[PDB]
Design a binder for this molecule. Sequence first.
Ligand code: HEM
Ligand code: HEM
Ligand SMILES: Fc1cccc(CCNCCNc2ccnc(-n3ccnc3)n2)c1
Ligand SMILES: Fc1cccc(CCNCCNc2ccnc(-n3ccnc3)n2)c1
Ligand SMILES: C[C@H](O)[C@H](O)[C@H]1CNc2nc(N)[nH]c(=O)c2N1
Ligand SMILES: C[C@H](O)[C@H](O)[C@H]1CNc2nc(N)[nH]c(=O)c2N1
Ligand SMILES: [Zn+2]
Lengths: 411, 407
Amino acid sequence: RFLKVKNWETDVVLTDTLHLKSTLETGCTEHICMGSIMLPVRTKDQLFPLAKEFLDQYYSSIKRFGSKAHMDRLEEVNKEIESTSTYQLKDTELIYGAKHAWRNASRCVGRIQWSKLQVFDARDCTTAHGMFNYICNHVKYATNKGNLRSAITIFPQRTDGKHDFRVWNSQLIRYAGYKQPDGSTLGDPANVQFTEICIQQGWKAPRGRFDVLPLLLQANGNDPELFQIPPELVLEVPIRHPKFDWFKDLGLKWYGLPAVSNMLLEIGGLEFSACPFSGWYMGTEIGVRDYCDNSRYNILEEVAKKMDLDMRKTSSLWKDQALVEINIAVLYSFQSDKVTIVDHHSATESFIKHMENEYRCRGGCPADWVWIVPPMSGSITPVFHQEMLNYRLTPSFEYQPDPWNTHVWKG
Amino acid sequence: RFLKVKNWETDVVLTDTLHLKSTLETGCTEHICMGSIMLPTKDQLFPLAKEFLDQYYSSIKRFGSKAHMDRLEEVNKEIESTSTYQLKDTELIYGAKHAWRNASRCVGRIQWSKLQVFDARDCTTAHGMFNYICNHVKYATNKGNLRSAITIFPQRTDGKHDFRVWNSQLIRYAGYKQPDGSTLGDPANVQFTEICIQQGWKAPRGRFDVLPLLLQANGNDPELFQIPPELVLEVPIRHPKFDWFKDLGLKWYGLPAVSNMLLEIGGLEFSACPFSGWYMGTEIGVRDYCDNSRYNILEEVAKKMDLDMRKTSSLWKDQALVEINIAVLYSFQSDKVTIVDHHSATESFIKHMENEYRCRGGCPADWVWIVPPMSGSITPVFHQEMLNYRLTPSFEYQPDPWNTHVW
Ligand code: HEM
Ligand code: HEM
Ligand SMILES: Fc1cccc(CCNCCNc2ccnc(-n3ccnc3)n2)c1
Ligand SMILES: Fc1cccc(CCNCCNc2ccnc(-n3ccnc3)n2)c1
Ligand SMILES: C[C@H](O)[C@H](O)[C@H]1CNc2nc(N)[nH]c(=O)c2N1
Ligand SMILES: C[C@H](O)[C@H](O)[C@H]1CNc2nc(N)[nH]c(=O)c2N1
Ligand SMILES: [Zn+2]
C-alpha cells in the first residue's frame, strides 16, 4: 500500500511505503486514536526471527544481502541462540543498530544528525564503578568544551531479567528537587522522588535550587550505587538576557548536555536496558518546558513582573510575552558561552528537509506530530503544517518502568 | 477497553467509557497513527435512525417508553414507504447540539447546549437561502455580542437535489492572482473567487473584499448574492502600544461561520448547515495573519518593530507573533466584539472535559487541533491526554461543490 502525506503550507505531497516494514503496535485502532497518549524474559521462540529481520536489514544496508558472509552470520546467530538462548552482536551491528534506533525515533526532531552518532561499546562493563567511569568518559566526550557531539554508551544487554544494568537517573545530568514542609518545592519538582531516593541511599544534599544530582548506577542486577560526576565535567550556562540586565539576577542557569539515561534500546530482539544517549538542546526544551511548565521551575510570573506586563487579564498575553523573552535569554546565553544549541525555527526547518530526504531515500520517516511541533510558536514553524505518519520500526528506543518500582533489593 | 487519560500537569486521571459507542473509523490502525492527517439505502438508514432515536429518548428519560417505541415504529414505516424520514423539531435541535458536542476538533464546546437552531427545512430557492443566511448573520452577530447559531437547510434526498453553500465560511475576504506574480487579498480564496467571477461577480480587486454568497438550492445551479454590508461587522486592528500598527491597514470580520460542512443526524444528511460561534484570537492573529500561505504579515510587522531579522535565534518571528495577537484581542475588545484568548478558551475546555467525563463518560478530542497554534505548553490542553473517536450526530467534511456539480 501507498500512503500520502501533505504539507498544507507548500502543497508538497510525499508517499510512504516504509510503514509496511512496521511490526510493533501504535496503541491506535480503527475506532480510537491514542496519538496524544504519552505511554500507550524473552524466549528463543520469538528471538531468531527478530535476529533474522535485523541481520537482513544490516546486510542490505551494507549491500551484502544474500552473501555467504550474510548466510554464515545468520547460521552463527541461530546456533548461538539455541545453544546459549541469546546472542552477541558484532561491533559493526551494534553501531548500525544504535544509529537506526535514533533514526527510527518518531519523537526526536534532531534526526537529521542520525548518521553522526558516536557509539561507545560498554558491553564489557561488570560493576557500577565501571559504569561510572564509562559515563564520565561519555560526558567529557559529548561535552567537548561546549562543542557538543552526539554519543551513546551501551552497557551489557538483558539476560534473564534478573541481572539488568540500569541507570536510575532519568538524565545523566539533572537538578535535585526538594519538597519543603510548607508544600513548596526547592529546585526541580520533576526530580523530587529521585532526589529522595538519592538521599536515602546516602547522598548529602546541598539543598540549593540547582544541585547536580549524583549518578545512581545498577550493574548486573545488583543494588544501585551513588557517584558524583566530577563538577569540572559538568558544563553549565548562567542565563542572562541581551537587553534586560535584571534577568541575570533571577539566578537561573542550566546544564549544556541533554542526556537521556532511562530508555531501553532494542536491537535484533536484544534488550539494552542501560544505554544513555546525548545530543544538544533545542532552546525550547529549557526555555519553555523546564523553566515555564507549571510543574517545573515555573518562572513565568516572576519574569512577567520584572517586565511590568499587565498581569490582571490573560488577554494581555503577558504569559506569551514573558515566554518569548525567556527563550531569547536561553539562546543568547548558550551562544554567548559557545555552547551548542539550536532554536526551534532552525531545528524544525532542518527536520523538514531531513524528512523529505528520508521519504526519497528510505520510503518514509515515522514522526510523532504531537512531539515534533515545538511547545511555543507552533504554526510559525514548518512542522505544524506538515502531515506525518507515526509507526514503530526496529531497532528502537523504548520506555521502561522506573527501576525503583521493579528492583529486587539485595540489601 | 476502559481507557484512561492523564493530565501530566495536575495528575488528574479520567476514565473514558464513551468511546465504546463510537461507530465510524479514525483512519488509524494498530500499525499506523494518522492523527496529524487533516482528512483521513433503506437498509443502511434504519439502524442509523434507531441508534439516534434511542439516544434521544434516553436523553429525555423515556427510553423503552411507548412514545419511544411508537416513534421508532413511525420512522421505520416512513423509511419503508418514503425511503427516508423527517426529524421532529425536538430531534433536529437535539441532533444539531450533539453534533457540536461531538466535534472533536472544536475547543469551544463548553457552550454546546446554548446553540440557537434555525430550522430552514422549508427553504426551496437560493433567494430563500440568502434570506435565512442574512437572518442567521444578524442574529448571531447581535451588534457584537455574538451568539452561537446554526441554520439547517433541507436534507439530501437522491444527492441530485443538494442544498449547498459554496463558500467555506459565510464571511471571508477575496483572493486575486496579480500579474506581478503575487497575491492580493486572501490566498486561501483565489479558486472560489474565480468561480465568483466566472459566474458573474463584479470583483473590486481589493485586499479585503467581503466575498458574495454562492448559494445552491435543490441541486440547481448556484446563484450569487451580496450580504448587506451593514450586517457584516468588521474590526480595524490596532495595537495598544504601537501607534504605527494601524497603518498596516489590517482588519478582520467578527463572525466566524463555517458553511461547507455536512451535518449527519440519524443517518440523514444536511449538506447545507452553516454554523457560527465567536473567534478564539489565535485563529486570526496566528493563522489568518501569520500563516505563510495566508496574509503572511510577520516580516512587515517585524520590520516596523525594528527587530534583528538576520538570525532566527533572536526569535523576531516569535516576538512579532505575540504583538500581532495582542492587537487582535485588544481591537475586538475595544470595539466590543466577542472574542476569547487562547488561555481562557483552553482553561474552559479543560473544565468542559471534566464535566463531560463525569456526566457522559468521556469527551472525544483531537489534541492536534485543540492545542493553540502559539504558546502551546503554557496552555493546559498541551498537558492533557485526549482520546479521539467519532460519535454521531456529527459534522463531516465534504467535497467542494465545484468538483461535483453537474452544471
Ligand atoms: C543531536 C541533537 C538532538 C536534538 C536537537 C534532539 C531533539 C530532540 C527533542 C527536542 C526531543 C523532545 C524532548 C522532550 O520534549 O522531552 C527529542 C526526543 C528524543 N530524541 Fe533527540 N535530539 C538530539 C539527539 C538525539 C540522539 C543522539 C538520540 C539517540 C541516540 C535521540 C533520540 C531521541 C529519543 C529516543 C527521544 C524521545 C525521548 C522521550 O520520548 O522522552 N535524540 N529529541
Ligand atoms: C461559541 C464559540 C466557539 C468557539 C470559541 C470555537 C472554537 C473553535 C476553534 C478554535 C476551532 C478550530 C478552528 C480552526 O483551527 O480552523 C473550532 C473548530 C470547529 N468547531 Fe468550534 N467554536 C465555537 C463554536 C462552534 C459551534 C457553534 C459549532 C457547531 C454548531 C462548532 C463546531 C466546530 C467544528 C465542526 C470544528 C472543526 C472545523 C474544521 O474542521 O474546520 N464550533 N472551533
Ligand atoms: F511518555 C512519557 C511520559 C513521561 C515522560 C516522558 C519523557 C519526558 N521527556 C523529558 C526528557 N527529554 C529529554 C531530556 C534530555 N535530553 C533529551 N534528548 C536528548 C536528545 N534527544 C532528547 N530529551 C515520556
Ligand atoms: F481537514 C481540513 C482540510 C482543509 C481545511 C480544513 C479547515 C480549515 N479551517 C477553516 C475552518 N475554521 C473555522 C473558520 C471559521 N469559523 C470556525 N468556527 C466557528 C466556530 N467553530 C469553528 N472555524 C480542514
Ligand atoms: C499529553 C501530551 O501527549 C503530552 O503533554 C506531550 C505533548 N507533546 C510533547 N512534545 C514534546 N516534545 N515533549 C513532551 O513532553 C510532550 N508532551
Ligand atoms: C498538518 C496538521 O494536521 C495541520 O497543520 C493542522 C494542525 N493543527 C491544526 N489545528 C487547528 N485548530 N486548525 C488547523 O487548521 C490545524 N492544522
Ligand atoms: Zn492514531
